[PDB]
Amino acid sequence: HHHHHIVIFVDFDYFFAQVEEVLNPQYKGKPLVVCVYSTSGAVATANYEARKLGVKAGMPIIKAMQIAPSAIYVPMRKPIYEAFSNRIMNLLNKHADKIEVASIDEAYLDVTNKVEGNFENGIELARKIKQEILEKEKITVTVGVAPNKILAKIIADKSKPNGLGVIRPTEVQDFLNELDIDEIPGIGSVLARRLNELGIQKLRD
């Protein structure tokens, strides 16, 4: 193929922490960490200022505080983020031939019909969707536009934050050529590490 589809992948930037910045404007520009407990605590999401100090999703709060003492630490308020996500997903629904809500902050839009297979028009539609989420919900997102869901996410991972990544039908074959298996969504570190011990590092191996 590389035509039967025109996909727009949408991925919200540092979502939980960003929603918190939207609600408390005074957090913006400062290291911020949303915390999750499941007894003991870990980082759920850190905004960029906090990631810049080395804070990462999954890091124990104790180790986070040790490296980012000056950060602000708040509790996870899932209901509210679900509320935001809900609204954004519904908004996306209105521009898609078909929609896959992969998670609270990830969604795939099939828009081949919507733009009658015109690729360039798909890009523009994506751009308009970036802006529409920024205005209606004040949240910035990163998107990827490609011929299929898989490529749409990869280009998107490479364009954050706040990006618009594109892989036109014509640049696909060679894109795959230099793709690290490592970069394919769903290929976990465990499978990746095992292929590596076998000297398999790229899609062409």
UniProtKB/Swiss-Prot annotation:
Its EC number is 2.7.7.7. One of its GO terms (cellular component) is cytoplasm. Keywords: Cytoplasm, DNA damage, DNA repair, DNA replication, DNA-binding, DNA-directed DNA polymerase, Magnesium, Metal-binding, Mutator protein, Nucleotidyltransferase, Transferase. Transmembrane segments: none annotated. Mg(2+) binds at D11, D105. It is found in: Cytoplasm. Binds 2 magnesium ions per subunit. It is an enzyme of class 2 (transferase). The record marks F16 as: Substrate discrimination. Coiled coil: none annotated. The catalytic core consists of fingers, palm and thumb subdomains, but the fingers and thumb subdomains are much smaller than in high-fidelity polymerases; residues from five sequence motifs of the Y-family cluster around an active site cleft that can accommodate DNA and nucleotide substrates with relaxed geometric constraints, with consequently higher rates of misincorporation and low processivity. It lacks the O helices present in high-fidelity DNA polymerases in the fingers domain. Belongs to the DNA polymerase type-Y family. This is DNA polymerase IV. The chain holds residues 2 to 205 of 354 of the full protein.
